[PDB]
Every structure is written in structure tokens, then in C-alpha cells.
Amino acid sequence: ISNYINTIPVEEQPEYPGNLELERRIRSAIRWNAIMTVLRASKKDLELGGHMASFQSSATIYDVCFNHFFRARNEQDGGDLVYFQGHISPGVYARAFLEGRLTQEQLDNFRQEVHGNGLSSYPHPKLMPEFWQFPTVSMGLGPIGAIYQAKFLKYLEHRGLKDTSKQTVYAFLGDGEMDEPESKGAITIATREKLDNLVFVINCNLQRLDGPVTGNGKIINELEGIFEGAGWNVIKVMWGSRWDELLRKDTSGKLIQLMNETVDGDYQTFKSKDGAYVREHFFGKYPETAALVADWTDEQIWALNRGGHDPKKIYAAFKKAQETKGKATVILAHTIKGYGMGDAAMDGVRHIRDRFNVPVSDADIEKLPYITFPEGSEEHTYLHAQRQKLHGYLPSRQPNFTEKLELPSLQDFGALLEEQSKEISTTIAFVRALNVMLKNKSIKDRLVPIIADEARTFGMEGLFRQIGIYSPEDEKGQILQEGINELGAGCSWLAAATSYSTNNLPMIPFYIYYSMFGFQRIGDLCWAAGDQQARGFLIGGTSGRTTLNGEGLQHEDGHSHIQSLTIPNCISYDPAYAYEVAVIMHDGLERMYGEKQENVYYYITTLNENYHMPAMPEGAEEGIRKGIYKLETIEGSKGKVQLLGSGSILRHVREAAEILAKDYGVGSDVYSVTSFTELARDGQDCERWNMLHPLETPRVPYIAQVMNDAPAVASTDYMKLFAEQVRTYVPADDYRVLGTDGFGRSDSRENLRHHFEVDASYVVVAALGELAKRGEIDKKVVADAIAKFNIDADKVNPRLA
């Protein structure tokens, strides 16, 4: 930690290149318009919300960047990737409006988007696909997402895919937000990878929402200490130009001492006082300091500003940042929250009008008018001249990539569609499908396999010799190894999954990890990924409650699919066979990176258990993609049931079908459900359409088109709700669902499958139970089966176990 003063002394401060007066004129108009759209929205009294205080404290920081640093998307690259602080959006809208990119009607529709011509509260690409790029409102996600975006840009350059050398990634953060563990939890990575293309801009106004970050301390010093410790280049923008003279005359070094010794809370109090309270309480601390302002008017004292409000001090920091190589830079900008709002945190509106000399007359002020700059005006000319010199306007977004890829056909996955000689798993099938893709000329180098330390666990070691590990094992290595960092890996996956839009360069990521450490551990990023229109593959390996058998409670995943189904644009599958994995992966590739360019990402749970992999039934392709298909029918004269299974449990329901036929003469229709979720969604869509079209013939859910009315039983390696979600659409009178509800524990797969009551014997008992209720068989028949199969009818519900 250094002295509590600017990192760059005036003598080392470059000359400011812009017209300060004209820029203030433009900046004031932007400030006014941002305040007007929020105030107009609030006038509606519809609890719309929207912030002003924050943007007021950081407007000049952004202004300097828009005028002299921010490079817009161009023919060569996607420009600078700016992670705009979420709640300062009204300022971004205000500027875009001034630039003529947004209309007054859209501003008047701030936070009212349902009808089409509105603006989102925050940066939401899904909602404004041609405007916003990075979802930053969920604090903490922006800093880490930006770190890996910067790393990914280096990756593209190192892999020879794209020269991203002219791009800088800017993460605009708040000091309070740095408390989120993901904000500083990964900063050493930027040092390890020498991310000199990443700039953290922390708005240090010393306050969070309900108070100061650390009133009894100095967060700017805490921030400097840890970022410096993490190897980052730290630039503190503490004081404005007015202080330069005071510090130079400060021969006793007492001013610096006073500055150093004052804590955040104190500084914050002076904030609400006056030029005399300051001189008395701040400067008045030491005669050496009090004597410095002795010859100063209380107004000249109160005129001393924080560095984050001085274009000159701001420019110096961003310039130094862009010059620095070898490591990332963090700019700690000292600002005043709710700057120039005084009374705030029509008299107040008149105050800011006067305060920033806004060109609005007394006659119009009540109309809460938006200000614009006429073509031909100095402000209009300058505003656009600065942007054009920087490649245009930002933020802006391109929803689809331009190139045409020559994707592998399903037949290219032919070997995976055949019966397998060796017993393998769906994970081995996944890796195999990856290899098929690695042979496709068009996308082979666009593939981005991602691992979080463990590769051997997922049988990925074989890929290393083929494509290598990115290690700028060299800068040309293709696989991203992020170590024990699921969030960081997800952020690399996200950068890769959105490269098609950001850099107009489609990249296809495949991140495989322990399924339990997916949505459960990085769920907020997964939701943000949906917002960012990520197109990629998330592979939840070692999935299923009873399949990762020895690991126990914090590893056994019987619910990730319940978490994944909450994301609208995530397509989830739980295949049982290798050929299903092939079909599913081929379809995803086609949908996401083929002509369709569907904004959806995939989640496929794969297993670590080997078993016989049969050949794909001819014509099963569509059913596999839709989520279900009849595997086969077993004859039985004494009854008929329908059996459903997915993942590693399907082969157990298949065994139950043979037992049912063999021991009870009960035949059955056996279905492989590759996706209970896609089926549920299809069912919901049909029922929704039916309800909205009362005069039309009811549409039939696909699952109802595939199944019949015979009593049905479903068993899965996930909690019952996974299969129970399609009940409404199952055309059978009876539908019994078996599942792995309850906490996992360590055992053999056999003991776990019996414990969670999802094995063959339970499926059989469940099937017999429905047939008995129908009078097709006697109840003593099921009571005997229960005894026969060594089933404890009275053991505690596994959910409670």
C-alpha cells in the first residue's frame, strides 16, 4: 500500500488530448438525459425503479473512455469488450440516445419492454440482442467473466484463430461489489496469464447500497494491498488537479499523513459538510495542514475534488493502463456517490439543471425534456468525431455469426451408432464424438474442450496428445485446463460460447466436470449465460445419484437436471446409450452452429459406468432428439405395462421388463427417455396452445404420441420430479415414478440402487402394484414379489434417510 494520493504525479501526467469544455457540455447533456428517463419512468408510479446516484459518480470516467479509449466493433475485431456496471445503464442509454442510436420513445419506455419498444433495466443481451453484450447486474460475475474473456482473447490470438491484440477488456466495478467472492477470488489468474489486455475499473465512491464498504477503514487501501499482492498494476486516481498545488507546497508531508490516516467514514462525513467544516476538521488537524489552506477561501476548499471526477487524472490512468504490458491493471477511481445531486442521494431537478449548466429553459424544465444536439452543432460534431475515430459506437451487438461452417453429418458419427464391442460409458461416447468433430476440417480448430483439473476421471487424457493443452502444452495447446475452479472454467466456456457474436468467430466449447459442481455451484453464471445467448455444451460427468457410487453426499448428483430445467434456453438430456449421445451432440451442433443459429446451449449428463452399448434402432433419430422413443416391446399374456428409463437406470428398467415377462407373463413397451425435460416443455407448449385455441382440435404432446394407455412406471437416477414432470402429458391412467430423492452416501452401485429404490426389483414391484390395483393380478402377488426381491417395505423414505 502506497500513500493516499494519485499513483501518477502531475509531472508524469500526459497532456489531455480533448476539448475539456466541449466534453463537459456533452457530458452534462448525457447526465441530464439519464436523470430524465429515470424520472419520467418514476412519474408513472408503476414501481419501475432505476438508479441515478451511481452513474452520477462514474459518468466522467465513462465519458473519458468514450471520447478517447473505447474501441468499437470493427472489421478487424469485436472492439473493446466493456463490462459496463449494470445499474449505470440509464447513462449508457442517455449517450446512445444523444448519438442518435435510441429514440425518445425507447427512453420513455425505460423498464417497460413487454410491448417491444422499451429498454431493459440492465445489460441483458437476450432482451436487447443488438445492444447489450455482457450481463453484469448480478454483482461479482462481471469481474470474473471479464478475466476469462481477456484470457480467451489471448487464446484466440495464440491459437492463430484471430488477432485480438487490439482489444482491451474493461470490467467496470463498484467497490462494494468487490466483496463478492468471485470479484477477487480469481485475480491471480490475470497475473499467471499476464493479462495485459484486461483493465479493472473500480468505482471507489467508498459506499455500497446501505452504507460505506468499510467505514472504519480504507477500501481503496484494502483493494490496493490485495491487488498489488496478486501481482496487478495498481493505479489510484485519488485527487483532482486542485490538490496538486497543495501537495507540492506540503513540505512537512503532513497533508499526505492526514490523507493517509483519515478513514472512509470520516472522508464521507466531510462529503456532507462545507468548506469550513473541512478546513476545521480535515485541514484543521495539523497547523502544517491548516496553514496550507489558511490562504484559501472556504469555497476554494470545498472546490477540491476527488480524482475520479477529473478528466485529466482519469485520462492519465487509462493511458498508463493501455501502455502497461505483462500484467493486468486495476484503476481505483475515487468518486463522490450521487455527485452533484446535493439534496438527493422539481427543486432538485432545477438544482442539477443549474449545477451542470444544462441547456433547458425554465419554460421547459417541468416537461422533464430530453436534450439532443443538432447536426452541425459543436457538441454533435465532437461527439461523433470522437466515436468515429474509435471505430463507431458501443455497446452494440451482432446476434449471428457470418461464416458458414461445414458441420459433420450424423453419419460421420456412424461408429457411435453401431453396437459396441467393448462395454463403454456415455462419457467415453462423448469423448469419441469429440474426436469425430476434431476430424472435421471446418470446426476442428473451433472446438474448445474445457476441464477443471481432472481429465483422467473423464477419460480426456487421450486428447492431450492430439490437440494439447493451452499453456502460453504450449500457447498452441487447444484444451483449456482451468484447475480446481468450476466458476472460472464456466467463464472460459462462456467466453468461448459467445465468441460467435463478440468476435464474429464461432467457437464451440465442451466443458466436462463433476455434474454436481455445475448448476448447483455455478448456477448464477449459467443463468447469465442464457442471458448472454451462449451456444455451447456443458457436460455433467460422473452424473446420477447411484452411479458415482463411492463419492457420497456432496458428489452424488440426482438433481442437476432439476436445476437445469429452470433455464429457458438450456436444452438438457440424460442419455442411456452411446448412439443417443452421438445423435444429441450432432443435433446440438447443427442447431447452434448450423444455419439455424439457435440461441440455446446444451447440457448432457454423462456417466462413469461401462455397460453394453447396443446399436441405434433404425429411424430412432427424431425420437432421440425429441426426448423419447420406444426401444422395444416384450410379449406377455398376463398383462401389459410401459416402462421408462433414462441414463444409467434405463438398463435396470430393461432388466425389470425381462423379469416381468419371464416371471409374471407381463409384457411391456420399453422407452428410452433421452430428455424428460424437453418432453415436459413440449407438453406444456401443447396444453398452452390448446387453452388459447378453444375452437381448435387439441394438439397432442409428443410423449402422448409415443406412449399408450397401459399402466406406466418410470425410473431414473434423479429425484422423482425429473420423471414426474411429464405426468400431465403421459396418456396412461397410472404413472408410477421411481427416483433418487434424498442425500447420497458411499456404497456399491448395487446397494445404492436398492437404497434409493430405483433398481430392477423396485421397478417390477411398482409395475405389479399398478396391475394389482387394476385387478389384473392379486395383491398377494406384489406382496410376494416384495418378499422375493428382499425389499424392506418399512425402511425410512430415502429422502429422509
Ligand X SMILES: Cc1ncc(C[n+]2csc(CCOP(=O)(O)OP(=O)(O)O)c2C)c(N)n1
| Binding-site entries for Mg(2+) | 175, 205, 207
Which one of residues 9, 14, 49, 348 is an interface residue with its own copies (CB under 8 A)? Answer: 49
Provide, rounded to whole angstroms, the least separation between the CB of residue 704 and ligand X: 40
Binding positions for ligand X, 319-338, rule CB under 6 A: 337
Selection from 522, 483, 478, 484 nearest residue 496 by Cα: 478
511 binds ligand X (CB under 6 A): no
Q: What number of helices (H) and strands (E) belong to the chain?
A: 33, 18
Which one of residues 144, 238, 336, 679 is an interface residue with its own copies (CB under 8 A)? Answer: 144
Distance CA 410, CA 387 (A): 47
Provide, rounded to whole angstroms, the least separation between the CB of residue 301 and ligand X: 25
Distance CA 524, CA 331 (A): 27
Q: Which residues pair with 424 in a beta bridge?
A: 611
212 binds Mg ion (CB under 5 A): no
Residues contributing to the annotated binding site:
175, 205, 207
Binding positions for Mg ion, 163-182, rule CB under 5 A: 174-176
Distance CA 265, CA 279 (A): 17
Whichever of 92 and 371 has its CB closer to ligand X, that residue is 92
Whichever of 187 and 583 has its CB closer to ligand X, that residue is 187
Write the CA distances from 351 to 90, 94, 348, integer angstroms.
19, 19, 5
Binding positions for its own copies, 184-223, rule CB under 8 A: 184-189, 191-192, 208-211, 213-214, 216-217, 222
Binding positions for its own copies, 238-277, rule CB under 8 A: none
> Residues 447, 416: contact at Cβ < 8 Å?
no
Whichever of 175 and 724 has its CB closer to Mg ion, that residue is 175
Binding mask 28-47 for ligand X (x = CB under 6 A): --------------------
Binding positions for its own copies, 671-700, rule CB under 8 A: 680-681, 684-685, 687-688, 690-695
Which alpha helices (H) appear in 452-569, and where do they start and end? 461-467, 486-497, 499-502, 519-531, 560-564
139 binds ligand X (CB under 6 A): yes
Which one of residues 252, 594, 751, 789 is an interface residue with its own copies (CB under 8 A)? Answer: 751
Return the C-alpha cell found at 554: 456432496
Which one of residues 56, 207, 532, 674 is an interface residue with ligand X (CB under 6 A)? Answer: 207
Distance CA 633, CA 357 (A): 81
Provide, rounded to whole angstroms, the least separation between the CB of residue 248 and ligand X: 31
> Residues 224, 234: contact at Cβ < 8 Å?
yes
Distance CA 227, CA 458 (A): 35
230 binds its own copies (CB under 8 A): yes
Q: Which of the listed partners (ligand X, its own copies, Mg ion, none) does 156 bind, with a CB threshold of 5 to 8 Å by partner kind?
A: none
Distance CA 201, CA 70 (A): 13
Which one of residues 99, 157, 228, 776 is an interface residue with its own copies (CB under 8 A)? Answer: 228
DSSP 223: H
Provide, rounded to whole angstroms, the least separation between the CB of residue 660 and its own copies: 15
Q: Which of the listed partners (ligand X, its own copies, Mg ion, none) does 736 bind, with a CB threshold of 5 to 8 Å by partner kind?
A: its own copies
> Residues 137, 86: contact at Cβ < 8 Å?
yes
In sequence order, what are the residues at sequence separation of 6 or more whose Cβ sits closer than 8 angstroms to the Cβ of residue 330?
Answer: 199, 200, 201, 202, 223, 227, 232, 233, 234, 235
The region of 240-248, 366-374, 412-420, 477-485 touching its own copies under the rule CB under 8 A is 477-485
Whichever of 183 and 478 has its CB closer to ligand X, that residue is 183
State the DSSP H helix or E strand holding residue 623, giving kind and residue range, or none if neither: helix 621-626
724 binds its own copies (CB under 8 A): yes
Which one of residues 175, 244, 587, 590 is an interface residue with ligand X (CB under 6 A)? Answer: 175
Burial 146-161 (b: 16+ CB within 10 A, else e): bbbbbbbbbbbbbbee
Which one of residues 614, 747, 776, 789 is an interface residue with its own copies (CB under 8 A)? Answer: 747
126 binds its own copies (CB under 8 A): yes
User: For the chain, how many residues are written?
Assistant: 801
Size of site (CB under 8 A) for its own copies: 149
Three-state SS sequence of 106-159: HHCCECCCCCCCCECCCCCCCCCCCCCCCCCCCCCHHHHHHHHHHHHHHHHHHC
- Give residues in contact with ligand X (CB under 6 A): 54, 87, 137-140, 174-177, 203, 205, 207-209, 337, 453-454, 484, 486, 514, 517
User: Contact positions toward Mg ion, by CB under 5 A?
Assistant: 174-176, 205, 207
